[model samples]
Target chain A: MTQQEIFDKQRRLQELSEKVRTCHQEASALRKAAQEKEAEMLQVLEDIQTI
Target chain B: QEIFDKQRRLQELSEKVRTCHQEASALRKAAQEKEAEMLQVLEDIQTI
Candidate 1:
């Protein structure tokens, strides 16, 4: 590839990488939210058992 | 030559998008599993 071609590819790759990063961050948020929900339920159950 | 280059880049982008979609699917699956697990725990607690 010519230098210009290489530069173009780099730019495209950068865009795709950004897309990946966004998807990753969103996934992380979802997983964290689910975990928090699970933790809340577990806490409630634990409190009930304490009785 | 330009046509080939454009087509090749198009294919690359298509692959990238498909991979991204699969990753998103996996994330959704994990969230669903966690929700199911929480439901199971709740059911067990109810039985207690």
Candidate 2:
């Protein structure tokens, strides 16, 4: 299978990679939010168990 | 279930973003380990 890629200067890849990396960072923040929410879900599950 | 759904979506989307990073990193890895190339790219994607 042919891999699709645009040939360009390292300059563009450098810039775009930086941008994608930033998006990934945003993803990380979302991950933290998800973790917190999961913990809350666990607490709710426990509350249900006890009550 | 709303929160769970929300977290599910968030996990999927965040992973989608991360997958994109990895795919981009794959080619980026050709010359260097995706890690170092990503480093040259920036620190955030590596951490994120």
Candidate 3:
């Protein structure tokens, strides 16, 4: 690839890296939300059991 | 009845948790694919 082509590829890499970072952050947030919901579910289950 | 309401709420929460986990897994898979593309770009750059 020419120098310009190489530069373009580098730029694309940067963009992809950013996308990956965002995806990971979003995924982490979703997982945390899931955990919180799971906790709430467990609490409800415990309450039901006590009844 | 109180038990009935609690049971319904538990079911809703369980569904929500399942959906969240499914979405998270999809996002992780997308990220992995992007990383693979990035690797390909890096290789192409090296070849240049």
- Which one wins on TM-score? 3
Whose DockQ is greatest here? Answer: 3
**Residue pairs with backbone atoms closer than 3 Å in model 1 (clashes):** none
lDDT by residue (B1-48, candidate 2, tens digit) is: 578876776665666556555554444334344335446556543432
- In model 3, the Cα lDDT at residue A3 comes to 87
lDDT for each candidate structure: 0.59, 0.53, 0.63
The C-alpha stretches of model 3 lying farther than 4 A from their native spots are: B1-48
Query: Candidate 3 chain B: minimum summed lDDT over ten consecutive residues — where?
Result: B39-48
Badly placed stretches (over 4 Å) of model 1 are B1-48
Question: Which of 2 and 3 is ahead in TM-score?
Answer: 3
Candidate 1 lDDT for residue A10: 74
Tens digit of per-residue lDDT, candidate 3, span B26-48: 65565566556556655654553
Candidate 2 runs further than 4 Å off: A1-8, B1-48
Better of 2 and 3 by lDDT: 3
For candidate 3, write residues A1-51 as lDDT tens digits: 598988887887777667656656665665565566556556655654554
Greater-TM-score candidate between 1 and 2: 1
TM-score of each: 0.49, 0.40, 0.52
| DockQ values, each candidate | 0.04, 0.03, 0.13
| Best model per lDDT | 3
- How many residue pairs clash in each candidate at the backbone level? 0, 0, 0
Instruction: Give the DockQ-based CAPRI class for model 3.
Output: incorrect
Instruction: Report the Cα lDDT for residue B6, model 1.
Output: 64
